[PDB]
C-alpha cells in the first residue's frame, strides 16, 4: 500500500530528472506543497502548480542545466519506518553546504540553513543535492 | 608522431629561428593534449628542438578556439589579460601590467616581432593603464569633435551625453528604446535627436561636397 507520500514524491522527481521529463505530476498534499515551495526557493525546480478542488494534482516543473538534471541527488531521511529528529546544533550539512536538507520545524518546513539561522531543529525530511 | 598522424592541429608557425620559437597548436577534443605531446616527459622532445638547429627558445601554446584565443596565446610565454579589436587591421593591442610587461615584451626587437606574426597580422603591446587612457580618449571624442552631429540646446545636451554610451556618433543603428527610459521622453523627439545626428552625418557628407 502507499505508506509514505513524500518519498513517493521524491522518487517521482528523481525519475523525471533521470528520464528528462519536463514536468512531474502527482496528487497534492500540504506537506508536499511546502516541500515543493522550498525546492523552488532553493532553485532545484522551476515552478510548481497545484490544480484541482476535489483531488488536486501537484505538478512540478523540472530543471535542466547544460543538458543534465539539476537535482543530482534526492533522498528521504525521515521515513515512516524510522523517524529522524534533529536538534539545531546537530543539524546536518548536505554536500558540505552546497546541497540542502529539508527540515520540518515548529515554524514550518525550511532548509537546514534557514532552521539553523532561526535557532531550532526538527524532523529531517530529505536531503537534496 | 601524433602531429604526423593528424592528431596535433598545427596551423601557422610564427617563430624566429635563432632566438625564440613559440607556436600554438589546436587538437580535436579527445584527451590528446597537443602541447603535452609536443613537450613530452619533462620536455623530452622539447629539449630535442631546443638543441636541434641551435639554442632556440621554442614554446607551445594550447590553441583554444578562433582568433580571439590566438591573441593571448601569441603573447605567451607571459601573462595576457585583455586586448582590443577592429575590422581588417584589428591590431591586437596587448593589454598587460608593467610588472608582467618586462617578461611579456622580453626584448624590444625579439618578442615584439615573434608574437607579431603569431596571429599573422601585428600586435601593439600596451599597459593596463594605457588601455584606460586610450579608452577615455574615445568617449570624449564621439563628443571630442566640436559636436558636429545633431545639436540643439547645450544644457539638455550635457544631461543627455551623461547617460549616453559612445556619444551619439552613428548611434541610431543601436537600441532606439533605452533613451526613452531617460527622465523626459514625450513625443518621439530624442528618437528625433538621434535622427538629427543622422542628418548631421548627411551634413558632414554635404561638407564633403563642399570639399569634393
Amino acid at each position: 500500500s502507499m505508506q509514505d507520500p513524500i518519498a513517493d514524491m521524491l522518487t517521482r522527481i528523481r525519475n523525471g530528472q533521470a528520464a528528462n521529463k519536463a514536468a512531474v505530476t502527482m496528487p497534492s498534499s500540504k506537506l508536499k506543497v511546502a516541500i515543493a515551495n522550498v525546492l523552488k526557493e532553493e532553485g532545484f525546480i522551476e515552478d510548481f502548480k497545484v490544480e484541482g478542488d476535489t483531488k488536486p494534482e501537484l505538478e512540478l516543473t523540472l530543471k535542466y542545466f547544460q543538458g543534465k538534471a539539476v537535482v543530482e541527488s534526492i533522498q528521504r531521511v525521515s521515513r515512516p519506518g524510522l523517524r529522524i529528529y534533529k536538534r539545531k546544533d546537530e543539524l546536518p550539512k548536505v554536500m558540505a553546504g552546497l546541497g540542502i536538507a529539508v527540515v520540518s520545524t515548529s515554524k514550518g518546513v525550511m532548509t537546514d540553513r534557514a532552521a539553523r539561522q532561526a535557532g531550532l531543529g526538527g524532523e529531517i525530511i530529505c536531503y537534496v543535492a | 608522431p601524433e602531429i604526423g598522424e593528424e592528431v596535433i592541429e598545427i596551423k601557422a608557425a610564427a617563430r624566429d629561428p635563432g632566438s625564440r620559437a613559440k607556436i600554438a597548436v589546436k587538437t580535436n577534443d579527445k584527451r590528446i593534449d597537443p602541447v603535452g605531446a609536443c613537450v613530452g616527459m619533462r620536455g623530452a622532445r622539447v629539449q630535442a628542438v631546443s638543441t636541434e638547429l641551435g639554442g632556440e627558445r621554442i614554446d607551445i601554446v594550447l590553441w583554444d578556439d578562433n582568433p580571439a584565443q590566438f591573441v593571448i596565446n601569441a603573447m605567451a610565454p607571459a601573462d595576457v589579460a585583455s586586448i582590443v579589436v577592429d575590422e581588417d587591421k584589428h591590431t591586437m593591442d596587448i593589454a598587460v601590467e608593467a610588472g608582467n610587461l618586462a617578461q611579456a615584451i622580453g626584448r624590444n626587437g625579439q618578442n615584439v616581432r615573434l608574437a607579431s606574426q603569431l596571429s599573422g597580422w601585428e600586435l601593439n603591446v600596451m599597459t593596463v593603464d594605457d588601455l584606460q587612457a586610450k579608452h577615455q580618449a574615445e568617449a570624449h571624442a564621439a563628443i571630442d569633435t566640436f559636436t558636429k552631429y545633431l545639436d540643439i540646446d547645450e544644457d539638455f545636451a550635457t544631461v543627455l551625453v551623461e547617460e549616453g554610451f559612445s556619444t551619439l556618433e552613428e548611434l541610431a543603428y543601436v537600441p532606439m528604446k533605452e533613451l526613452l527610459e531617460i527622465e523626459g521622453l514625450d513625443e518621439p523627439t530624442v528618437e528625433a535627436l538621434r535622427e538629427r545626428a543622422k542628418n548631421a552625418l548627411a551634413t558632414i557628407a554635404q561638407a564633403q561636397e563642399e570639399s569634393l
Binding site: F65, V70, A96, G97, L98, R113 | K30, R31, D33, V39
Partner: protein, 156 residues
Amino acid sequence: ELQEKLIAVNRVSKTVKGGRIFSFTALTVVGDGNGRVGFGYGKAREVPAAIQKAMEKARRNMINVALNNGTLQHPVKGVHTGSRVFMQPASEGTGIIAGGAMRAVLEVAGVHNVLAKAYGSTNPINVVRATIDGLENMNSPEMVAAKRGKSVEEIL
C-alpha cells in the same frame, strides 16, 4: 610538467596448444598536479613496453576535477564494479590518507589533503576507476550556483 605513476604491473596468461603464453599489464596514472587526471591500462609481452603503452593511453582520455585549494569541495563517493570508494575533504597538513592505487591517483591529481577509504574490492584497476568517477562527479560551488540560478554567496 605532467607527473606519471605506474600503480601496478601484473602478469597474465593465455593458454595455447603449446603451453602458456605470458604477458604483462601495466596500470598507470598521470596528472598535472591540478584538476586534470588520466589513467591508462596497457598490455604487452614485455613489461617496459606495456608500461609505455599505459603512459600513452593515460596521456589521452584525461579528465578535469574542480579542486578547492589543496583538497576537495565536499565528501564524495565513487564506485566501479566492486571497488566502492569514499573520500572526504580535509584540512591542510593532514596529507593523503588513502590506500594503494587510490593514493596514487590522488597524488597526481594534485590533491594534497584527503581522508579516504576504499570499501569493497581493492582491485587496483577498478578502484582507480572508482576514484576517477568520484572525482569527476564532484562539482564545485560555482558550478552548483550556475546549475541552480543563484550566486555563490546565496549558497555559501
